[model samples]
Target: DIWIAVATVVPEGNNVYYLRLDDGDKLWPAATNYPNYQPKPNQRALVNFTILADSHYIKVNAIHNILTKSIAKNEGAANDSIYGTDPVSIYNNNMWIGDGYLNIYFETLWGGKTAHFINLIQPDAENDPYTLEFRHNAYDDPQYTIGAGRVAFNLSSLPDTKGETVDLVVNYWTSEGKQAYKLKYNSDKTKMNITDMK
Candidate 1:
């Protein structure tokens, strides 16, 4: 199966990589045939693999690194310009929270040699503290065509809800304007929170 999973380096003989699925489940890859890109611990990646007889093990043929990030605290409005909130189109199906990460799939305009910076920031006290802002800086890249990518944010920095499910609002900019998303967040498996986006 081709899946996106958080890679964890199990401390065995070497960096034996394991899969942390979006469902909060774990799987260890037993036969890793490729020696190309090495995945860092807690790094998200696109993996192509087949399950072994045990089902807990897999044969990995490919592993592509995913852009993962830790949620940044809002420095203040004065620094907002530096953390640009450029427009992006969020894809719904692949967006979810799991393994202590808020995983997102999105699309944006792209061209030129410039690299775009993406961040998930917590709002300041003046605004809703539970709301998160998704910012983007294209570095003035031209919008020649649309490009797609995946990013995940560590949610540990957020306040502990004491095992209770709470509301988390995420803000992002689309080409038209801003979009808001409401999510149910709980550090549990069964209640893997559903999203209400508009």
Candidate 2:
């Protein structure tokens, strides 16, 4: 089940990306500078995704025709849906396992809950280095956000299942607000229906 490609954006606005790699040694590592690096990490020496804020760009051909008509209308039989997402499955705990195609941004917390910051890569170890693994919900409270920015980690209120077979990534921590999560299954996005569950 591999023949899908979606690429569009504008859930808000902001763009600047140009990456290229096809070799080895995969150098580039140093805790990625930090802060307003505007989502830094070109580690192996080929990355170009800079922005000053405002994101939304999410229309890549109607979300890839609603994720390939929801994976060609699944009808059971262990539809693993590509093991993780686009081409994810990082081990040694660097955490990237959405499996494939994921780009989410977030904000909005205090009960309804909302906090996201996801940028995925490694379509088969893209040169290595430059990795970011953040999972949240340990009573999170990074000032709860008002401005200044960078409080990403939105599990969308986690709790998923379809006979339960997911966990490709894990980590979570928040405080005062109360939360804690650690789960990962890399891909499957709940059989590509965006996890509505069965």
Candidate 3:
């Protein structure tokens, strides 16, 4: 049947994919049925697939590469719109910092074919308990529908915290008002460290 999950892949002997839902699971795909879907080792993805004959193997029906990107640096008032002032919903257990990337499963409104844009800005000063702003632009769409999307922002641009775990404050506008997502980020940059999806 149809389902969605976040996962990564690798190739030692053959390409073996791994995905965790409420439990740890491995993926061995026959082929990616979806177009232009090249595999990325350890880069997270929003994977929509179907089980093929009850095996660890499956077919990718659709996939959205987790928007892994660098933190926007040296911002000023002029860069505001370039980033965005739109609303983005950040929910619990849908975010984390690992592998030098800030991963988020954000929700927002979307409609029509026009694209929606998003970004993580370092906001100039932003050290230790670093202050960041999460930006989203709906492209002024014709209307709306709630959609959940994933993004991973590279934390490489921040100052060295000497492998220290410190607070990270992410600010974003929401339907109600401005929202803050507080998180702890360590410079250690470990592998696959995240709360399992529930």
After superposing candidate 1, which stretches have Cα over 4 Å from the reference?
1-13, 125-127, 188-198
The number of the candidate with the highest TM-score is 1
The digit string of per-residue lDDT tens for model 3 on 1-198 reads 888876654444444454533234666666576644556655667788888866277787777778777776645775566776777788887887755677888888778777887788866562322888888877667555888888888777776566566678988888898888898876665412121111
Top lDDT hit: 1
Q: What is the TM-score of each candidate against the true structure?
A: 0.85, 0.21, 0.68
Backbone clash tally (model 3)? 0
Alpha-carbon runs more than 4 Å astray in model 2 = 1-99, 108-165, 177-198
Could you give candidate 1's per-residue lDDT for residues 22-125 as a string of tens digits?
66566777787784445466677767777775528788877777788888767786445877867899856556776777778899999967899889998763
TM-score quality measure for candidate 1:
0.85
Say which prediction, candidate 1 or candidate 2, comes out ahead on lDDT: 1
Give the root-mean-square deviation of each candidate in angstroms.
Answer: 4.8, 18.4, 6.8
In candidate 2, residue 23 scores what lDDT? 18
What's the lDDT for candidate 3? Answer: 0.69
Candidate 1, lDDT over the whole model = 0.73
Local accuracy by lDDT, each model = 0.73, 0.25, 0.69
